[PDB]
Amino acid sequence: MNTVPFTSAPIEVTIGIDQYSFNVKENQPFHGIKDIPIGHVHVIHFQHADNSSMRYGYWFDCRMGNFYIQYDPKDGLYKMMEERDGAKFENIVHNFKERQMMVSYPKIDEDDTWYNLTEFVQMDKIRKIVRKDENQFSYVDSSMTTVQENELSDPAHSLNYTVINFKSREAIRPGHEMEDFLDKSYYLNTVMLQGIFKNSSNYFGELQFAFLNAMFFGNYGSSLQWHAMIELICSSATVPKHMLDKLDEILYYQIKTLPEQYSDILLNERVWNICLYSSFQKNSLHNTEKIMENKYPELL
Amino acid sequence: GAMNSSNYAELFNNDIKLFVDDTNVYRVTVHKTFEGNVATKAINGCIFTLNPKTGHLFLKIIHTSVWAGQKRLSQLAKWKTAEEVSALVRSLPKEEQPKQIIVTRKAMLDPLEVHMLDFPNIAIRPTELRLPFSAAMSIDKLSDVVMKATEPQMVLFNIYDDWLDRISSYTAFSRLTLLLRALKTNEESAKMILLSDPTITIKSYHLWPSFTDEQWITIESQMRDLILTEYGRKYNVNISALTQTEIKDIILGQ
């Protein structure tokens, strides 16, 4: 069980760790998060009490290094850093645990929620979407734009999601205009799966990462990407049976986890109505359709 | 974005543009079967592609063979329209290609945009104008070439005949829209008004009669009265009661 120690907490902040969150007071003797489950990516995230515009965080994987958080009073945020000295780090963590100054990652034994949200998400794929090669962890915030949003301005600070555009030469074979526009199977199976993602696991990983950035940071471009990747499957007549069964499970847990009070801003009425009631796959997402109908019947 | 009353002069500037109307592409007669079910029988159709500045009409005849063994024909008709418009643009020399294509029906936007992806600098626009181009098939010579076609055919016409020798494109378009609005509201009455005086003929190379400037004023008046007479006949409205502002508004209204 891994640990992300904090140097200190000089400013009042709501701290998220995956789907959990807790309030830290200004100069509260808080020195980090312990018992973080090995085997998954994690996200530690922040919303300052004095300024909710500051909404930002770090994707990391404790298998890849020893990470800690330290507040920077110049840049005015909690920063993730890597400690290269194994023995200094172990000695820091042991002291803070002895003095019981760390919150425990509060996982219920029965509860597979985080696995179910991150099943296909891999740090090496995150680091290609979020390019900062000198760090093993990835910073995301509420304001970061996507490569696609920036084409319609700083490229170093962008989310490099795979561009999906239904009215693009990439999406439409010369001479198959109506066929490819009304049935996106070509675009899904040949261009995106075989061509760009190489397999459904990489496709689902990016879809799951987009959803989590939408949910945790209110990142608008991430929300657009999540819905585009759902719509591209639902608008294809020809999808492998395993991919439809897996998508239904993925979306079920995403809709289950979404805070009820954010449904209005995080869910696109048109895409969901089209996907569940009009698309080729309208009858292929049993679990998703039942949770959406019971939790968000107004949207539909 | 959308072409409307506010940006009407733009039709007559020097940027090449085409209107595309797809309302006569897929045409059927609905009938009873021997077993008392209902069936459709397709008849020949046409794409109405018009340069409003020059009067140049690209009439692509849609032969019923196009539909043979195809499903969801009203959907296919939009895509076939977009395919043929795309083929027409690619057939034109670069300096003759339109800078904008205005579709008379919003359902044509996605099909045309997808067929014209190769032409990113050609703008595909809807219009807020209610244009009476559906009445094209009430023009005898256009109806005749469509119904006689035995194969796919493109036929080129000038829908203004020689009017541009005497009037501006703005006035020529206004005359065309008034004639087509009249043909659309009461075809019998419109044809009577245009073809009653047998001394005024249609030249072999023209669509409309050879009216003098003064006769066009009389014709145009008779068309506006017909649209009002019919608008009265429709809504049960004493038209002899209406003022000239009241009257002006209803023609443009429609």
Ligand SMILES: CN1c2ccc(N)cc2O[C@H]1O
């Ligand atoms: C020169 N004309 C012309 C060229 C192209 C089309 N479609 C029509 C035309 O009517 C003629 O006036």
